[PDB]
């Protein structure tokens, strides 16, 4: 008893209780009020005519990119070129290069301009099969500019057939105006930005860049405390350049996830395992930054810590708008299997966004966010990159290709 039905689909359920991809024999998938209402093997059936026959095509949950900075203005391309040519970073920086140039360009960009700049980026993720994307602020570094980014994020979720989770990342770096008083900036975030963002219902979570050239463990704790007071979930950019113990702090605050982790240690891994925190791998940033210190994948696996994989789309360290390329890199650079990568962009990605109960698996009762592909096996999703392969892209039970 459901409005729409997809006949003859070969489901890669990605169910948490099923091995590998949770692939099953051909089934019939029916949706009711935006949710998967029923999953019945075809042998138990023998339509109406509005029922769509997929003729055995593979179906999977919609992909999820749980860590992006896709909203931004300006371009760091010229700066990159100069570096490749051999110009010292000091010269580039003294002339205002680096993350600050993105901040100035983004502050200067109007809300309408950021929206128009982000549209084409989100459309590329959409055609790859991404149905839920997380977008962070962090390039505003002022109360008005940080919320401006969050508003653009909400706008994208309303204008396009894709779910958007917003994350306040005001603690991405210390703005120029607070250069000599970092703690003053932290107070602003805690006493003004988080409260204003929460009051407007603009933030689903709060993030922090905890590092030596970022925010200290103490300053990071101040932020999580404020988030806590407004009932906002927390997460953080941890152990990317060094270990300050940030992952353990985040775990103690019930973080949804910790991201990067190149320098994560055993103690931290133990904390993550115990608090059920998701470890988010960002292979693209690792690639582009030409890093050599690999995240402790083997240890994370041994401890059973779920690992999500994300594109980390951002103008500074990962200018690649592709979730699937990230999956390919997680396998090639971090040694993940195609099945770990797939769970990394479904089941585990959902959990990293606090949506473990609603998305990421083809189970009765969960939201109807699924994809019908023209390729034969799910392993191919992490393998062949750059080709449009969607036959059907369903979000909340409704077709979105046309
Ligand atoms: O440089 C940028 O624009 C963002 C870099 C990005 N943010 C962070 O905390 N780590 C990264 O790699
Ligand atoms: Fe990031």
Report DSSP letters for 221-261, one per residue.
HHHHHHHHHTT-EEEEEESSS---SHHHHHHHTT-SEEEE-
- Residue 141 in contact with ligand 1 by CB distance below 6 A: no
User: Which residues, 6 or more positions from 396, have their beta carbon under 8 angstroms from its beta carbon?
Assistant: 34, 367, 368, 369
- For the four alpha carbons of 261, 312, 203 and 305, in that order, the dihedral sign comes to negative
CA–CA distance, 384 with 328 (Å, rounded to integer): 8
Closest ligand (CA of 99) = 1
Neighbours of 125 (CB within 10 A): 24
- Residue 102 in contact with ligand 1 by CB distance below 6 A: yes
3 state SS of 185 = helix
Q: What was the elucidation method?
A: X-ray
What range defines the domain where residue 381 resides? 1-61+361-402
- For 109, counting Cβ atoms within 10 Å of its Cβ (0-12 exposed, 13-18 middle, 19+ buried), the class is buried
CA–CA distance, 337 with 342 (Å, rounded to integer): 9
Residue tagged 């958007």 (tokens): 164
Closest by alpha carbon to 11, among 349, 398, 346?
A: 346
Q: For the CA atoms of the chain, what is the radius of gyration?
A: 21
Contact 89, 76 (CB under 8 A): no
Contact 278, 247 (CB under 8 A): no
**Are 19 and 99 found together in one domain?**
no
Ligand 2 centre distance from Cα of residue 312 (Å)? 5
**Are 46 and 139 found together in one domain?**
no
Ligand 2 centre distance from Cα of residue 140 (Å)? 15
CA–CA distance, 394 with 129 (Å, rounded to integer): 9
Neighbours of 46 (CB within 10 A): 5
Nearest atom in ligand 1 to 209's CA: 9
**Are 342 and 246 found together in one domain?**
yes
In angstroms, how far is the first alpha carbon of the chain from the final one?
A: 25
- For the four alpha carbons of 152, 157, 161 and 163, in that order, the dihedral sign comes to positive
Ligand 1 centre distance from Cα of residue 314 (Å)? 7
Closest by alpha carbon to 311, among 80, 125, 79, 131?
A: 125
- For 138, counting Cβ atoms within 10 Å of its Cβ (0-12 exposed, 13-18 middle, 19+ buried), the class is buried
- Residue 137 in contact with ligand 1 by CB distance below 6 A: no
Using most ligand atoms within 8 A of CB, pick from 79, 99, 261 the residue to mutate for ligand 1.
99
CA–CA distance, 1 with 6 (Å, rounded to integer): 13
**Are 235 and 383 found together in one domain?**
no
Residue located nearest, by CA, to atom 4 of ligand 1: 316
35-41 and 27-32: which strand pairing? Answer: antiparallel
**Are 277 and 384 found together in one domain?**
no
- Residue 72 in contact with ligand 1 by CB distance below 6 A: no
Ligand 2 centre distance from Cα of residue 252 (Å)? 21
**Are 392 and 265 found together in one domain?**
no
Nearest atom in ligand 1 to 214's CA: 9
Closest by alpha carbon to 139, among 172, 112, 165?
A: 172
CA–CA distance, 354 with 64 (Å, rounded to integer): 12
Contact 247, 258 (CB under 8 A): yes
**Are 11 and 152 found together in one domain?**
no
CA–CA distance, 375 with 378 (Å, rounded to integer): 8
User: Which residues, 6 or more positions from 337, have their beta carbon under 8 angstroms from its beta carbon?
Assistant: 331
Closest by alpha carbon to 189, among 237, 221, 212?
A: 221
Q: What's the DSSP call for residue 193?
A: I
Ligand 1 centre distance from Cα of residue 291 (Å)? 14
CA–CA distance, 15 with 375 (Å, rounded to integer): 20
> b vs e for 321-359, b when ≥16 Cβ sit within 10 Å of the residue's Cβ?
bbbbbbbbbbbebbebebbbbbbbbbbbbbbbbbbbebb
Nearest atom in ligand 1 to 72's CA: 3
Sheet strand arrangement including 257-260: 63-68, 130-136, 163-171, 205-208, 233-238, 257-260, 278-281, 307-309
- Domain CATH for 2: 2.30.40.10
**Are 144 and 20 found together in one domain?**
no
Q: How many separate domains does the chain show?
A: 2
- Domain CATH for 312: 3.20.20.140
CA–CA distance, 350 with 402 (Å, rounded to integer): 26
User: Which residues, 6 or more positions from 281, have their beta carbon under 8 angstroms from its beta carbon?
Assistant: 261, 295, 297, 307, 308, 309, 310, 330, 334, 336, 344
Neighbours of 67 (CB within 10 A): 31
**Are 23 and 129 found together in one domain?**
no
Please tell me the total number of residues recorded for the chain in this structure: 402
Q: Kindly state the tokens that stand for 14.
A: 């990605």
Phi and psi at residue 148, in whole multiples of 5°? -60, -45
CA–CA distance, 180 with 354 (Å, rounded to integer): 36
User: Which residues, 6 or more positions from 32, have their beta carbon under 8 angstroms from its beta carbon?
Assistant: 1, 2, 3, 397
Residue tagged 């929460």 (tokens): 198
Q: Kindly state the tokens that stand for 369.
A: 């966010």
Residue tagged 């994300």 (tokens): 310
**Are 207 and 130 found together in one domain?**
yes
CA distances from 247 to 37, 286, 378 (A): 38, 18, 32
Q: Phi-psi region for residue 114, left (φ > 0), alpha (ψ -120 to 50) or beta?
A: alpha
**Are 354 and 366 found together in one domain?**
no
**Are 128 and 177 found together in one domain?**
yes
278-281 and 307-309: which strand pairing? Answer: parallel
Q: Kindly state the tokens that stand for 315.
A: 């103008």
- Residue 35 in contact with ligand 1 by CB distance below 6 A: no
3 state SS of 278 = strand
* Cα angle: 268, vertex 272, 275; to 5 degrees: 135
Contact 143, 193 (CB under 8 A): yes
Contact 372, 6 (CB under 8 A): yes
């Amino acid at each position: 008893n459901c409005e729409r039905v997809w006949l003859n689909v070969t489901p890669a359920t990605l169910r948490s209780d099923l091995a590998d991809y949770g692939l099953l024999e051909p089934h019939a998938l029916g949706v009711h009020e935006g949710r998967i209402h029923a999953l019945v093997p075809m042998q138990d059936l023998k339509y109406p005519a509005h029922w769509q026959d997929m003729k055995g095509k593979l179906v999977t949950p919609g992909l999820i990119d749980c860590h992006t900075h896709l909203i931004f203005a300006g371009s760091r391309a010229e700066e990159f070129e100069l570096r490749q040519k051999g110009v010292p970073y000091a010269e580039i920086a003294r002339k205002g290069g680096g993350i600050i140039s993105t901040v100035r360009a983004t502050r200067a960009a109007s809300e309408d301009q950021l929206f128009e700049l982000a549209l084409p980026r989100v459309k590329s993720l959409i055609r790859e099969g991404v149905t839920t994307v997380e977008i962070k602020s962090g390039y505003g570094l002022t109360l008005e500019d940080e919320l401006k980014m969050l508003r653009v994020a909400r706008r994208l979720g309303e204008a396009l057939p894709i779910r958007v989770k917003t994350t306040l990342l005001a603690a991405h770096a210390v703005p120029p105006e607070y250069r000599d008083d970092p703690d003053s900036w932290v107070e602003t975030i805690c006493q003004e930005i988080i409260p204003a963002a929460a009051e407007a219902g603009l933030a689903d979570a709060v993030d922090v860049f905890c590092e030596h050239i970022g925010f200290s463990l103490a300053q990071t704790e101040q932020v999580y405390l404020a988030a806590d007071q407004y009932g906002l979930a927390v997460k953080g950019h941890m152990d990317q350049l060094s270990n300050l113990g940030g992952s353990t702090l985040a775990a103690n605050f019930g973080a949804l996830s910790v991201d990067h982790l190149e320098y994560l240690d055993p103690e931290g891994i133990q904390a993550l395992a115990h608090r059920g925190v998701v470890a988010t791998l960002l292979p693209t940033a690792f690639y582009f930054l030409k890093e050599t210190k690999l995240p402790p994948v083997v240890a994370l696996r041994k401890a059973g810590v779920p690992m999500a994989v994300s594109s980390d789309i951002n103008p500074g360290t990962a200018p690649i708008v592709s979730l699937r390329m990230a999956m390919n890199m997680a396998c090639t650079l971090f040694g993940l299997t195609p099945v770990e990568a797939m769970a990394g962009v479904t089941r585990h990605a959902a959990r990293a966004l606090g949506e473990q109960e609603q998305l990421g698996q083809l189970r009765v009762g969960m939201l109807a966010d699924f994809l019908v592909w023209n390729c034969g096996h799910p392993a191919e999703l992490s393998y062949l990159i750059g080709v449009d392969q969607l036959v059907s892209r369903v979000v909340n039970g409704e077709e979105t290709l046309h």
